[PDB]
Amino acid sequence: LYVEDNWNKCDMVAIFLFIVGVTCRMVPSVFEAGRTVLAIDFMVFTLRLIHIFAIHKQLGPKIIIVERMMKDVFFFLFFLSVWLVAYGVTTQALLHPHDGRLEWIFRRVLYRPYLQIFGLDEIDEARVLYANWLVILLLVTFLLVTNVLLMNLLIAMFSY
Amino acid sequence: EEGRLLPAFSLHEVSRVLKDFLHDACRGFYQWLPDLSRKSEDPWRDLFLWAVLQNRYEMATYFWAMGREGVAAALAACKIIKEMSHLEKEAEVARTMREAKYEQLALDLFSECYSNSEDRAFALLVRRNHSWSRTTCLHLATEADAKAFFAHDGVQAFLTKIWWGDMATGTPILRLLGAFTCPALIYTNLISFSEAAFLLTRWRKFWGAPVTVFLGNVVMYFAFLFLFSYVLLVDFRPPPQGPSGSEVTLYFWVFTLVLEEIRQGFFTDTRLVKKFTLYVEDNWNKCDMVAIFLFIVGVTCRMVPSVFEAGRTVLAIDFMVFTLRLIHIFAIHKQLGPKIIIVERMMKDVFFFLFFLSVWLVAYGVTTQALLHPHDGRLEWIFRRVLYRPYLQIFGLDEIDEARVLYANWLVILLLVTFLLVTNVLLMNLLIAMFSYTFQVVQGNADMFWKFQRYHLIVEYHGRPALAPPFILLSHLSLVLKQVFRPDPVDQKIITWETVQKENFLSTMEKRRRDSEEEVLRKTAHRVDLIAKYIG
């Protein structure tokens, strides 16, 4: 019966996070990680706060519809990730064939598509030709196919 | 008149032109003429042809009615009809011919027989047709491209039963993944298995099912994409030997892949040109051909040290091609399919959209530049700026800032605003309008084309040889070595069952027509007319 409801399950995860965070007091050496866990648990309680919202007449429908469409977000992970990794990795190879430290390359190649989602400092040094124009075209087609389309289909399904 | 080198034409030309319409479907017809005195082997089919050719619809309908083995006819006929559309003289005569809709008859018959004893329905669907010169119904549907027929649920039922082959069962997506992860788990009863050598047979039935080989090969190819990418990233090394070791390691398997592709494309064949057109038909095989061409031309990088850079760029292009190829696996899923089909359908408007944005950008920026400056010492820098600005504008002034610090600026503002609205707001609102139009009205076509590609991939991977790509080389060797070394009552019962079902169907349709309300009105009108007459 208790396992049935999802909200009680979220409460169980929250209290588990609280318990494992309480170890921060137990361990002085790893206090930082314990604090991070406690922040995670705080975020869990924040998510738990939402359960009260749908109770209202006007708020209810919106909440239910958002939760129903909330399944497509884990799906949308696929195409954007594929296009981003394809694009950036290929451009990097053209830009350079060998990096002295993997780390900095990791930071740049991670930030760019991550940055791209939110909308070149490392890139600027490299720029100052054949590779750039194809990157432009792939950027444009990507822009259209994910942002324009997979959102138009999503609002279509949301109205449905 | 072309073959020779009371109307003159004889059955020779009839059989010739029929073989022309359908190559292997109706080739054995009328086997240079026979003695006319002899009666035909099966008249009803001949007369059905005679009618459908002359486009006498109701006649052909009845001619089918009293004809056995109906469903294959109700397909071949529609094939011939749709074929005889581009060779139509009168557009008016072409429209009614295009209004044949013979496929609906086959659909109704197959639905009827599927309703009862599907174990017989599937057997029929794969039963060879003596009447139609020993051909398979599915091949007929292909030659006819009767997509709607495939959209029948019983079709999908048969496909799904095949899709897991002998193993069948519910086959949970997760449970199957886990069972495949642990080879020991196979022997246990995690999922249902239909009815040491016994364990060998069970493992064979496990890895023989279509989904299994499909998942295995797609996973291996995807991981090979990943490893090839890594090789391109840092392992694309100078002409020392170890470097080339990475290249040969990543390239020999690619050669094995192209060998497997040729095997799938050429020996899936009457003539070599036939199989060539078969391979050229599918777009995905065309993308594979472009990919392997890119791989070959990139392999020249190893050949030329001086131009290694360009070769590396080409290899990156080929990597991107393989990335695009990876998408083909996505639409297979139920939920993913429709979205993929709709996106591909709308993917045509993107090359169109090239027009307006480009025109507005070149107009705006070039004009502003002229106002900004009348002469540039170097074209290059001007090229970089004037290219980056509208390119930059699409993605959302450093050179511009120096120029700024008045009459030209405000008109640039207004043109920027109207451009913003007309492309970004409008040509996207119209695009989402057309996208909803697709995903609703052409949603039927989307589901149809999706199930179509589903059937295609299913039957294709059925023919996937029983081996991994490495051993597939040994499989081809075994096949070449084998090459160098080298009932009726049941069928009658099934045909009779089909005939009974057809008779029941037609009787039911006529009975439904009898109780039609308009017929009731007309009959009551005739009755009241007669009654008023008898009254006076």
Add this chain to the structure above:
Amino acid sequence: RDSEEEVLRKTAHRVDLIAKYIG
């Protein structure tokens, strides 16, 4: 002529005349 409303009206006139002739 074959319009369904016209059919209804004609049948109504006919049944009126028939009921009249009956009585």
